Design a binder for this molecule. Sequence first.
Ligand SMILES: Cc1cc2nc3c(=O)[nH]c(=O)nc-3n(C[C@H](O)[C@H](O)[C@H](O)COP(=O)(O)O)c2cc1C
Ligand SMILES: Cc1cc2nc3c(=O)[nH]c(=O)nc-3n(C[C@H](O)[C@H](O)[C@H](O)COP(=O)(O)O)c2cc1C
Ligand SMILES: COCCOC(=O)/C(=N\O)C(C)=O
Ligand SMILES: COCCOC(=O)/C(=N\O)C(C)=O
Ligand SMILES: COCCOC(=O)/C(=N\O)C(C)=O
Ligand SMILES: COCCOC(=O)/C(=N\O)C(C)=O
Ligand SMILES: COCCOC(=O)/C(=N\O)C(C)=O
Ligand SMILES: COCCOC(=O)/C(=N\O)C(C)=O
Lengths: 360, 360
Amino acid sequence: SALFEPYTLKDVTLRNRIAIPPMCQFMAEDGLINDWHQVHYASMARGGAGLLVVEATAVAPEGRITPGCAGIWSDAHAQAFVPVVQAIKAAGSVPGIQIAHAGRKASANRPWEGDDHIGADDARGWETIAPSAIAFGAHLPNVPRAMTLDDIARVKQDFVDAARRARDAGFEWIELHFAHGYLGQSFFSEHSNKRTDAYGGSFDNRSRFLLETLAAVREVWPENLPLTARFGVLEYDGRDEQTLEESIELARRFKAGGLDLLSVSVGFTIPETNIPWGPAFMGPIAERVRREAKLPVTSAWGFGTPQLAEAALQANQLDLVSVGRAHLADPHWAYFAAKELGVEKASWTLPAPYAHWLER
Amino acid sequence: SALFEPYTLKDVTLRNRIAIPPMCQFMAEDGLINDWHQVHYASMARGGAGLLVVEATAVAPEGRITPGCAGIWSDAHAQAFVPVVQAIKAAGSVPGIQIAHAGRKASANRPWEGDDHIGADDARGWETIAPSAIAFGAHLPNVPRAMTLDDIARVKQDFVDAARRARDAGFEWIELHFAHGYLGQSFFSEHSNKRTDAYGGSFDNRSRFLLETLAAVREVWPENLPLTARFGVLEYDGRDEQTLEESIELARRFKAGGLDLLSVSVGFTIPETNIPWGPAFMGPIAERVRREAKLPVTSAWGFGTPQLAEAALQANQLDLVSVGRAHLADPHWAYFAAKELGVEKASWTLPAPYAHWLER
Ligand SMILES: Cc1cc2nc3c(=O)[nH]c(=O)nc-3n(C[C@H](O)[C@H](O)[C@H](O)COP(=O)(O)O)c2cc1C
Ligand SMILES: Cc1cc2nc3c(=O)[nH]c(=O)nc-3n(C[C@H](O)[C@H](O)[C@H](O)COP(=O)(O)O)c2cc1C
Ligand SMILES: COCCOC(=O)/C(=N\O)C(C)=O
Ligand SMILES: COCCOC(=O)/C(=N\O)C(C)=O
Ligand SMILES: COCCOC(=O)/C(=N\O)C(C)=O
Ligand SMILES: COCCOC(=O)/C(=N\O)C(C)=O
Ligand SMILES: COCCOC(=O)/C(=N\O)C(C)=O
Ligand SMILES: COCCOC(=O)/C(=N\O)C(C)=O
């Protein structure tokens, strides 16, 4: 089975092609993770996935999505991740982390607590920042503060500091969150970037914040550990052909800047879209990015059955299959997939105290 | 769905009828549990089961089955369970513990490390004790030492001390391990008990160790928390009708002695048996014990599908359905069962950071 072939990138070898993508838990307090995360991540890692990318972790307090988001903006925040890193490793999985800045989507309620921008009378809210003073709209009406050149320098340094902290905590895989309408995505998109300086307008200018952040992180992230990013390559906004061509060109420049793998996603930059949700719908798009930018890729959003994941790998559409929600349903999903795909000794996808008994 | 109706026993209310029965992990060192158990138990409790009975925990070092078995023979051992108790309660499940003494089946290798008695030349092993100096046979050939009267007094006090510690550590449910051919079961069975003193021979004498241990534990275990036991009520040894009749009579004496619920199992006292393994095969036996001894019961050994579990409850064969191996496969099995049985808001069997997304 292709899903259960190992994968080597730089000095890191994953035991299979199942990746757990970053999934916010909204359970942190003042950015500090706790026993929710410790058990959540350790259990999924024991489930058998080869790579576990920890949830969007804010590089600065105002870069959290919600008051429940994890942060890594101080050394104390980074030290809190050390037992998560070590528990993922102890399970035989590879610990990764997505470092993030929510941009204009920040200062929002948890999804089961309204999912909307926090009210200005609520003591939990904060001022958001973005390329331009333009609101997402819909359930996120708060207008962000337009960043100055000094803000751009500071946020870039925050990504650098976060990458250095993640390195020292023992993460072996880093993902820059340039997707999903948060800060990085919003610099790239003409929907949200109306700037008239070096960081808006042309393709080079809109790419500049993302390329400069990648280059600054590259200075401190080890050359022998995978340096990756998540990027929304189209919006389903009626501009898909031109947007995908530009996004693929940016992927070429990411590769020239030392990126090892691209997590291919959807932009979610504005609400006025028509995303064609369906099983493995990102397959053909990820395949095109992979082939045209000549870069390894993963994707998500509907690959969460064993046969769909296997098919995407056999078709060379993906190098790793990211399986998110199925691992919330079943933290041992990788074992379930090994059983369904007829892997020999499938129960030994799990550690011995489970594997021995599920073999019979 | 009967499976998702709450259950109240003494002052304890379980949110559904799904119980996770004790399942040895063989991962402790010198009796002390560790990060294996912490994540293992916390993840299963978050999965939605109403009651989680922690694995067979030895009341004395020689009462471990293996060198990997958990123990509670000192206050330091008991304090190590506190974070497990806390994590089970934090998930909304009820923490229980099975306290145990392996008797003549002690000093054995882990199941994936030979599953047999440790050799006499192997320094990891220890002398075993039992009612009589007679081996189980087969893969457990070691002849135990016949217990002295002082041994009997000491082991009873060890059960008391273990129950006292479990109480003070915050367990809300206790299970005396009188099943599966270990010490207590071997006092009851004529196969293993050849004693000629007050603890062997007659039905009263063979019952004596179990009744005296129950009474001694009853003195330190709170009135308002369920006091339960696991007991093998037949062997499938060709003596089933007579053995079941005597076992039900003992269950009546357990009830008179304050037992609140009986976990009905098979004796496993000797290897020369013909156990008719199959789906829900214990259903009719558990029902007969429940009805004739007028005690609430649980059972296991093949109820691990949602429909089999639901059927056993609707037929009033069980009060709680114990689902073991399916929870090793999927720690969120209770959520899987809620979906299959069409429970409304089935995803909210899980905590919010999962439930919100699995509801869609
Ligand atoms: C609860 C939850 C949290 C998520 N958090 C993140 C995140 O922090 N960063 C990110 O890039 N994507 C995040 N996502 C998107 C997922 O990584 C993934 O793309 C999505 O769940 C689709 O894959 P799936 O169909 O296998 O679930 C999250 C998704 C969910 C359901
Ligand atoms: C790994 C494992 C450990 C077990 N440990 C115990 C134990 O410590 N005490 C006990 O009474 N039964 C123990 N059992 C038996 C189970 O509690 C249960 O009766 C058995 O797994 C059958 O239920 P199931 O079909 O739902 O798995 C264990 C079973 C397994 C597979
Ligand atoms: C305390 O155990 C942490 C996780 O340990 C495992 O998952 C494991 N075996 O149990 C291996 C070899 O990976
Ligand atoms: C509608 O938004 C979908 C894309 O955004 C995400 O997946 C995400 N973080 O990247 C979270 C926390 O939801
Ligand atoms: C399926 O694993 C093979 C044997 O499993 C069992 O029957 C069992 N518990 O379920 C024990 C403790 O022996
Ligand atoms: C509200 O979620 C219900 C599940 O319980 C928890 O939250 C939890 N552990 O279970 C911790 C340590 O946060
Ligand atoms: C073949 O024996 C089955 C009955 O014994 C058990 O289930 C048990 N403990 O009670 C363990 C640890 O296996
Ligand atoms: C989860 O079921 C509802 C659909 O929501 C999503 O697709 C999603 N992630 O999978 C996010 C972050 O919005």
